[PDB]
Structure formats: structure tokens, C-alpha cells
UniProtKB/Swiss-Prot annotation, chains A, B:
InterPro entries given in the database record: Aldolase_TIM, FBA_I, FBA_I_Gram+-type
PANTHER family listed in its UniProt record: FRUCTOSE-BISPHOSPHATE ALDOLASE
A Pfam family per the record: Glycolytic
Organism (species): Porphyromonas gingivalis (strain ATCC BAA-308 / W83)
Family stated for the protein in its record: Belongs to the class I fructose-bisphosphate aldolase family.
Active site (UniProt): E178 (proton acceptor), K213 (schiff-base intermediate with dihydroxyacetone-p)
Biological or metabolic pathway of the protein: Carbohydrate degradation; glycolysis; D-glyceraldehyde 3-phosphate and glycerone phosphate from D-glucose: step 4/4
Protein name as catalogued: Fructose-bisphosphate aldolase class 1
Enzyme Commission code: 4.1.2.13
One of the GO biological process terms: glycolytic process
GO-annotated molecular function: fructose-bisphosphate aldolase activity
Amino acid sequence: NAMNKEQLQQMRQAPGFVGALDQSGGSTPKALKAYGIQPDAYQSEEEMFDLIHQMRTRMITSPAFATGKIIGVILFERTMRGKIEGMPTADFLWEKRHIVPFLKVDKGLQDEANGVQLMKPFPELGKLCEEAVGYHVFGTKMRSVIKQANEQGIRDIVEQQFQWGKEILSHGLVPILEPEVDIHCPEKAKAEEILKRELLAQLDKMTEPVMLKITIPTVDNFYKEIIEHPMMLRVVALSGGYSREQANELLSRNHGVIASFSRALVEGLSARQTDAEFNAMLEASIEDVYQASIK
Amino acid sequence: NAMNKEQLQQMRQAPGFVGALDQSGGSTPKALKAYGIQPDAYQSEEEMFDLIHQMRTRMITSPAFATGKIIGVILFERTMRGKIEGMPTADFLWEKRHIVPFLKVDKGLQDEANGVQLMKPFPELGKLCEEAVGYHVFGTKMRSVIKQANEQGIRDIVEQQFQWGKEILSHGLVPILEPEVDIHCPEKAKAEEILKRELLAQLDKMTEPVMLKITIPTVDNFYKEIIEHPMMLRVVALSGGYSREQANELLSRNHGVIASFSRALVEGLSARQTDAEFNAMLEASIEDVYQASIK
């Protein structure tokens, strides 16, 4: 209620960025390996999930996460059901760190068709949304993928994204729509042209604001009209394959767009480095992403 | 003589890739910070250069560098004048690690004009080349930058690259030409189209082979005709802003092109991590880049 309204204010006004911690089981080995934990070091799914939970706990409890430069955090569903320092993760994010909690609500992608990969339908979405409200989660995130400058395909991406969004809104949660255009798209600017056009037409019909998570565009500042649309709460940006230094550099050139990075935020961090170095490097990466986010 | 010929064979035939360690003074703070050494930790240029020399020593002496997956290494001039385990760096690379040593021979870039940044002229190049021969260095590397699909500009890039190359050859050194097309180029495929066309026309007039270091192309396999040209020894590829995972993924799709990575090879590594983790992560990153390089 008063959280909600204070969280809404943060998400709309506050300078800073969102950390994406929302890797599904299928994406956790890759994140663990990059943290220096090789697949060879665990051999059950439970052990794997503990291991990534220790990582995220180590991030969230670190002094670097107490800065206010990170305004939101996106969670995997298992993490929301877990604890940090004996306290439900979302609650710890907000009560002890002043970070607005979100949850990834998608169940993965369909096979590519029409140059795009739509989200797998998820019948029990509304059940996840009510569960999230029970954890005081403020918003959601959902990812869909554009591989080509296909008008039908991109039309569909956006329409599925907004359907899911109107449904999520109903539950009193703010959805982040994530229609990622692959950075290796043969015609990226063209695809982003279609995407923008579909996006605005949907926003014109909306009666409540949403957020958007997009690849940093080929044309600097291309998303201005989106950022400025009164039904757009905030625009955040995926790295999508760029290094932290590259994403930041391009991000600096997109006025009003803030970061939403996963593995890029965290490059350099490892299991068996001292706590001192972990916090220092984490603090620096955050400062870098912040300075880029605020331009 | 018999090194030379064994090194030539490695560079032409051997599967694997080249590690680029050739950061100038101007680029060393960025590499140090990414290794967890903040600018704030040293305050002279000598201390900075020691610090990056310890890093490179720690890489080169590590068991991960004894794999044969790395076939060449590119050195900054100061490193060539330094030692590893009391032995000149280039000599240690070859005698103790079976890695072919190269040296970066450029002095930086000119201001952008015609959508490109040519290399600053370097009158004493030939003096550096003779010095390098004295250290038993096998080859050189030189970097020039293409920001736009400008025909005059790209014509010039290539012509300067080959002039420098014919000069370097004279000294009995194999040059790696590096005409980098920025990954954020508004018209990358088009620029790579011009680049390829200029490159082939120069190669048709060559009487001795060279090597090429390029951005991974927008069109998969675009450089085939180059790789196949009898005056092309080997094609290597810069990351140029892609994460290690992204560069590897795209690299896998370019048949016969091997990696030549600097900061991407080394993402995850830090000063204050245990020797054990440093070697493990280094070994894994190398294995990854290798598997991508050999496709």
C-alpha cells in the first residue's frame, strides 16, 4: 500500500538501475561457471541451486548492494521462495536494502518461427502472480526474442507481451516487457524500427503504465518517443552479449535509459576471491553501470 | 632460422588461438581495474607498469598457458624488454611454452576523418622491427579503426595497413594487419563489404603472406575468400566489445577464423583470488575460446 506507492515512486523517479538475478535452472550452470564454479563441482540440481543461492546471497548481503544505485532487483522464482539472513528474499531486498523486488514470470521460449521466438504459454501465470503478491513482490519480468526484421513476427512478439502485461497488471503488479532483439540481427535497426512502431501503438491503447527492457538500439536515442510516452514507467536495457564496458558505453549514449544487467554486472566476481576484493569490484562495476545509466 | 620455420608452421597450421597482451600505457589502467586493481592503488607510471607486468607474468607462468591451445601471444613493447622468470619475455614464450611471440608496433590513432581513424605515422618503425628481431620476435600487430561504411576512408585504412605490412616483412617479421570495424557501426555489413573488397585487391598484389585481425563479421563466414587467399597466412578475430560468451558463439560460426582476445580471455580473473581458481578459470576460458576457434 504505502510500500507499493513508495516503490512506484522509486521505479518512476529514482536514478540508478536494476540488477537481474533471475536465471532459471537451465541458465544457472553458465552463471556458476562464470563465477568459477565448474559443472564438475556439484552433481545434483539441489546442490546447484544452493550454490547459485549462496552467490546471490553474497551479492545481496554485500555492502555494495546497500548503495541506492541499484533501485530494483529481478528474482528467479526459487530465490523468492528462499531466504536471505533468515528473511524472505523480496522482503530483505525492500526492508533491509531499499531495493524494489521483481520476479521473472516466463517459462521459456517457443521454437523460432517468423524470425522470432515467442514465450511458451503459461496457464498458471495468475497463480504465480498471486504468490508473488503474497511475497510483496512489486513487479514482474518476461522475456521474448526477435531474431529478424520480420513484421508479422515482431507484431506477434509485442501483442503477446502486452496481453501478458495486462494480465499481470490485474494482479496489481507492474510488468517489465522484454522483447529482446538479438545484437547479431542481420537488420537490427530495421527490426528496432518495427519494434518501436508496434510498441507505441500498443502504448497508445494502454490505460496503465508498464516498463520496457530492450537491447541497446543501433541508432543512439532511438527509443526517445517510448521513454517519453506517458504509459511508459521506465525503460531498462539488457546487455545481450556486450561486455560490461561496451554496454555501459553504448548505454551512456541513450538518454534516460537505465541498465538491467545480469552476467555483465558480475563479470570479474568469483567464488574463491576474498570478501574484500568481491565488494570492491562489485562496488566499482555498480558505480560504472550507474554513471552510464544516469546519462 | 629453424625457430622461424617451426614458428611459421605453427602460425599457418596449428589449431588454437592467440592471446593479445599488448595493451599500451594508455590502456593499462582499464585492464588493471578489470583485474581488481583500481587506479587508486598505484600512483606512478612505474608502479602501474610493474602491476600489469605481474599480471601478465602470472598468466604466462600459469599451467593454463602451457596447453598448446594458445599458439601465439602479442606483446606490448615494454613487456618484450622485460623478463619472465629471469628470461626475456619473447624467449620464454617460445623456449618454455612453445608460444610464438608477436609485438604491437603501432603508436595509436589519428583523429577520425572520412569515418575512419588511421594509425599515427611512426618514423622509427624500422628501428622497433630490428629491436624485435634481436628479441627473436616472430611477428607484429598494428591497429587501425573503421567507424563508418566510407569507401575513401576504408580504401585508406587498407592501403596504410599494407604499406606498413610490406615494410615489416622486409625485416623478416610477419605482420598482423588489424583494421577493426567498430561493432556499433551504423552499417557494419556494408563497411565489411568494402573492407573485404579492398583487402582482396591488396592481397592479389602481394608476393608474401600476411595475417589479418578483424571484427567478427555481421554476415557469418563473410571472410571465406580471404581465409582461402594464398597470401593470407591466418585470420584472427578481435572481440571488440562482445562478452567472451558472445565472441565465442559468433566465432564458432566463422569457419577457419581463430580468436585473438585481450580483456575477454581474462574476464573473471583477479589479483586477490587464489592461484588455484586463477588457473582453473584461465584453463576454462582458454578451452572455451579454443573450441570456438577450431570450428
